Amino acid sequence: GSAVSKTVCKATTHEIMGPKKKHLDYLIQCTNEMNVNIPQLADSLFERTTNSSWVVVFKSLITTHHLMVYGNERFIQYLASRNTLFNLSNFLDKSGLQGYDMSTFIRRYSRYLNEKAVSYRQVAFDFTKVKRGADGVMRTMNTEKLLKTVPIIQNQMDALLDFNVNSNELTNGVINAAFMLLFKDAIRLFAAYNEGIINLLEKYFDMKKNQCKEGLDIYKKFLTRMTRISEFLKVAEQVGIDRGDIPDLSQAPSSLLDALEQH
């Protein structure tokens, strides 16, 4: 409570680096305790995002992201249940050049985090977290739900890619901490998008005419997203990310000749 609220402040000091691991780990433990009040933990993070300083605001967003990824699922479930989340579409810290230039990333990052919560609200699970493979949800989900879902992944993916950062803009520890988490979400979200597309291709011949039609449009839009993804992983390569962590895209884009199976 006070211990929770004090820890949120320590994670979000004015210092120019990401939130410290020691504060994060305590926050993560907080989300795992049946007695902690999640809403109050959340409200403290929202309050920090009314600060005028870019450093404070960006650290509060990063903290929220890290709790969505590593915290108990009850945290994201609450965030997904509110009606309003971050409203930082007009944020601008004019106190210095660093401020002006970081303000833009703040806007774009906060939009991604909003879209991450809305996606959870819409499908009741986290795309980044569920079983992968052949025994997984995204591989074994009926044709109707699939057609419904893949479009939600696509949307979360676009918001993620709109961060649109270049290597030469990654110049302090705050934005770099955000980028490292964005990287982790991007690779998992891609895996789930790919699996979904694999299921589709599998069932696209045995399906109704108008379905086939919607299908077509998803594979269609997946291929343009593949290219944007490649541009993103190339930023990652430029920055120095271990090439073993960067996934290989040499997978599933040759068959656009079902644009005729609608005979």
Add this chain to the structure above:
Amino acid sequence: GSAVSKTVCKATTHEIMGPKKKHLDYLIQCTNEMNVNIPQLADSLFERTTNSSWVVVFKSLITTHHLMVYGNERFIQYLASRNTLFNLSNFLDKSGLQGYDMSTFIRRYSRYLNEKAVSYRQVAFDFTKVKRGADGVMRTMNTEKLLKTVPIIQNQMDALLDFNVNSNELTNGVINAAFMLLFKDAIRLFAAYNEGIINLLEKYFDMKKNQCKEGLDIYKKFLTRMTRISEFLKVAEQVGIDRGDIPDLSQAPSSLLDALEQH
């Protein structure tokens, strides 16, 4: 051969970023093919380190590191069988300031890579790669070999920590790629050092007097290394590394009161 040698050149161009993932992956496949001549692959990498340019030389070192970590074990086994490895103790690229400042990291990195090979030669396995836990080598190894080994881990660890970089020196994609690999080795090497110490503590009461003595000296030196390690992970924290990848050190340094069991 020519395909191998051409790929080494592409990994080590003059461009200021780490070696590209596409060239690395082909090199890794090379190490997995029973027909590829390992020595010739190696010699090409050594030849690149006679270039006068810091970029070329640092990329050749990074490529070698990445093959030691992700390549077939036959690669490191060969490197460990030569008598001379890198000799870059006097390297200096004076062509520009970036050169002067990178030269020092080149020296220190090459020493680490030498020590990684020598360690493999000495114990016949890679500390970063073996089974961890309670069913592992480092947890289940007899008292005699243990006393022999832990000192080799310690030595590899010191060479690794002598890289001695600050966050404000991580300023281009080449040195950042080196650092990301160093990070991966550091966390695994620590795990193995910790496991070793756990075995020791376990057997330190049931052992000879002079052994106990040597033991003492290893726990002794492990505690000072713990501190240096903490300083290293703090650089990692400053740079923006996902705090979930950074391990928690809150483990095994309270018992220095066996410095009296030698009664």
